[PDB]
């Protein structure tokens, strides 16, 4: 085994925003999901298509790990066939998903008494999101029939809004770090898997 990074995605000092979310293409070693079951209690462990118990023995061509921070009540939105603010505008999951979703609370690390406004998410967009494709933009979203020429104001809003996490928030409004694992196969010979 070469220990291709799983202790880096979960132990990163700084995560990404909802509309950014870092995508890591991990297929380089023998998978060691034993550490996944450890590292604090999990608010959710909802592997789809594959039983969580019988991981650690299955040959996967390419693993995709996506990480971002959201609030608690939106954690249930990271699932196939779900409609919501995060699903329709920030992060979309296909209906034929084969992977896992792991969420854990991060009030101690990702919250400040004054407020953490470094985390952003999109709220308004002309059209919805196709599965697994990003959109980073700052153009003013036209809400009427008068072009604003890139100037905020009436019927012309900025698409990104900040969270503002504070330690005294409730469970549903607390920061939650989410790692989603996506699996797929290709015609290339399988080499990235255990003995």
């Amino acid at each position: 085994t070469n220990l291709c990074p799983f202790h880096e995605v979960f132990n990163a000092t700084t995560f990404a925003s909802v509309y950014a979310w870092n995508r890591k293409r991990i297929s380089n070693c023998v998978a060691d999901y034993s550490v996944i079951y450890n590292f604090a209690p999990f608010f959710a462990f909802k592997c789809y298509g594959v039983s969580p118990t019988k991981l650690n023995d299955l040959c996967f061509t390419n693993v995709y790990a996506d990480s971002f921070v959201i609030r608690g009540n939106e954690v249930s939105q990271i699932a196939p066939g779900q409609t919501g603010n995060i699903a329709d505008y920030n992060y979309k999951l296909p209906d034929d998903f084969t992977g896992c979703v792991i969420a854990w609370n991060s009030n101690k690390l990702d919250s400040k008494p004054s407020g953490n406004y470094n985390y952003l998410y999109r709220l308004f967009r002309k059209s919805k999101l196709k599965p697994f494709e990003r959109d980073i933009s700052t153009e003013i979203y036209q809400a009427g029939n008068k072009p604003c020429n890139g100037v905020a104001g009436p019927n012309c809003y900025s698409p990104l809004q900040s969270y503002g996490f504070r330690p005294t928030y409730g469970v549903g409004h607390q920061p939650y770090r989410v790692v989603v694992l996506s699996f797929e196969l290709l015609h290339a010979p399988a080499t990235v898997c255990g003995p």
Partner: antibody
Amino acid sequence: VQLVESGGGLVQPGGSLRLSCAASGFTFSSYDMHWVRQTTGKGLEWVSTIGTAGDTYYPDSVKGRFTISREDAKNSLYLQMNSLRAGDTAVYYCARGDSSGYYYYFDYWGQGTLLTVS
Amino acid sequence: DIEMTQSPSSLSAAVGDRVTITCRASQSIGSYLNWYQQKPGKAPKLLIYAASSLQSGVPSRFSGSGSGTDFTLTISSLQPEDFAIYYCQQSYVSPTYTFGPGTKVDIK
């Protein structure tokens, strides 16, 4: 292959029981075990899950209240129940899980045992 | 959780007839659904996995057909050793597998 349950009886509310399931005819070190309860009307309901490497899974209902553990010395699976309520009255079965690839299922269930509260 | 519903609530037939029971899901589940038999006085037994595959041991008279959301289980010829309750359960979402309410097959 056979699975035999034990631990049935009556308990006052707030009590604790230690139900056991003994499996024979196969290797306990490979397959994974599940506890599934059945009530009249509501139907079957999954209660607990234990796998090969020290992992335990529970529903939202029975969370922070059940402590499923197994010992491979004599091929026995244990389930400890505390702070029992009136809704835990059911018949409990211990089942074995297996998959022919990506598709998972429960192979054998056994006989089952009865639990009631008053 | 993914709810599961079954139809019809009850079914009555004689020996040799063909009986079909349908199972409906709330979300798309692909081919992740399995079939169980609940002969009274005993424990449920596996009949069909992968929503189409025939488990080793069960007679071939049972057939599971479906893809997507709505599935069907059909017994071509009914026999007296079939009075039981049949359940459809999901495997797409783990480890919170959920069962159906079961069906009544009264032999008469």
